[PDB]
Design a protein around this ligand. Structure first.
Ligand code: ZN
Length: 44
């Protein structure tokens, strides 16, 4: 059972890459980009 009862998600927009949230569309656009080869292979 998940007795959490918490977690935001009342935004009309929500990134698809990560799943972030933004009350405005633009905010989501200028964000989605962040998922464009911003960093290299930080694992292995
Ligand atoms: Zn994102």
């Amino acid at each position: 059972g998940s007795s959490g009862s918490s977690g935001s998600g009342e935004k009309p927009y929500e990134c698809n890459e990560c799943g972030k949230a933004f009350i405005w569309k633009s905010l989501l656009i200028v964000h989605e980009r962040t998922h464009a080869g911003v960093s290299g292979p930080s694992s292995g």
